[PDB]
Design a protein around this ligand. Structure first.
Ligand SMILES: [Cl-]
Ligand SMILES: [Cl-]
Ligand SMILES: [Cl-]
Ligand SMILES: [Cl-]
Ligand code: NA
Ligand code: NA
Ligand SMILES: [Zn+2]
Ligand SMILES: [Zn+2]
Lengths: 218, 218
């Protein structure tokens, strides 16, 4: 597997909120991943080549192939490991399981959970119009949604510390409900029971765009 | 074109001086590039799929396909631009030509010069045995070799500032003489006349190794 990254987190955070890459373009280089939509209109979650748009009101909907993204990370998911949990386990305990199995922080990880979540707390960015406010101020204003006792799917990546300028260092995880109508970017969660599948990734492709805003960003 | 990078500069600088990637492996993903040999036994220069080993005594020799590298950057060279210089031009003037043509620091550049150099000054790392001394102290001790009025070839890359942890930010250029028996890592040069060919690169593949020293490096 190759982690295929569209653009750079530094470019996104600098104010480059639009790109020309479509959701269909993303699915050329993976069936699994995360990212942001143009104008920061929420975030995407993708697994088994199904893509959904998660928005600031807690909603999820099917992503359309023509929608565009300024930043995303995709892969052809090829997990090496599977662990079933029959009793409650916290996000941080699950990360401890992954980190024991893949202890080098110098590798990436892709992870998926299918199961029943005791709770899943989410906060997702709303669509932005320029001039842009500081991202931290936008996040201060966004409600946290709390999904309680819901079946659903989690998609995530673990990014090395040696990558903080380029991508989201540490764990980045998104959630969607079984009915595919709710979800968001995860702040914390606890799994009541479910199946974790995950694997390490050694290869990263960074595709730098050609739009003028990216080229002129500092 | 894709800039194909073997490992990380941060790993090399941390003391990971050996890898399992061979020169033949490098040529699977390019015909052009630069890098370091195992044990820091000099550096490589590659152009038109010819690879040479440049060592601390100023010498160049044909690189053997079975030799291994802990760090390298390769591409299938596809320049978009050609400029002939009939009168002397300094390294920094040449970089000004490139930077005017490719002004976004957010893109990579690959560059090649074929011509007659007024001078080319080089300093190249010697083979190291552990425990390793600080790289800066090793470089303090290495002689600078001065190639005067020599025909030769220059190979180089320009790396964005948004990449300093991962690769050599700015320009990184190596030189070899026409007889292929002298060369090194360039500190400065002046071209008397010659041909510059160069182009921009938007895609970077990072291939992270699996050897234990890389996995355990901080
Ligand atoms: Cl249940
Ligand atoms: Cl997250
Ligand atoms: Cl001449
Ligand atoms: Cl250089
Ligand atoms: Na968000
Ligand atoms: Na050197
Ligand atoms: Zn997110
Ligand atoms: Zn060098």
């Amino acid at each position: 597997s190759v982690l295929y990254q569209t653009s750079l987190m530094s470019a996104l955070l600098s104010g480059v909120y639009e790109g020309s890459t479509t959701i269909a373009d993303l699915l050329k280089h993976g069936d699994f991943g995360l990212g942001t939509f143009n104008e920061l209109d929420g975030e995407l979650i993708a697994f088994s080549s199904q893509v959904y748009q998660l928005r600031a009101d807690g909603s999820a909907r099917n992503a359309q192939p023509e929608q565009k993204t300024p930043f995303a990370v995709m892969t052809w998911f090829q997990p090496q490991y599977r662990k079933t949990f029959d009793h409650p386990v916290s996000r941080q305990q699950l990360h401890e399981v992954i980190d024991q199995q893949i202890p080098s922080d110098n590798l990436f990880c892709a992870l998926r959970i299918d199961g029943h979540f005791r709770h899943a707390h989410t906060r997702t960015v709303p669509r932005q119009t320029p001039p842009y406010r500081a991202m931290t101020d936008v996040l201060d204003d966004q409600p946290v949604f709390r999904f309680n006792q819901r079946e659903g799917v989690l998609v995530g990546f673990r990014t090395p510390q040696h990558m903080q300028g380029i991508n989201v260092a540490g764990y980045h995880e998104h959630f969607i409900t079984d009915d595919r109508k709710g979800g968001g970017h995860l702040l914390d969660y606890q799994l009541d029971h479910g199946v974790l599948t995950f694997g390490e990734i050694h290869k990263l492709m960074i595709d730098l765009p050609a739009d003028s805003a990216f080229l002129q960003a500092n």
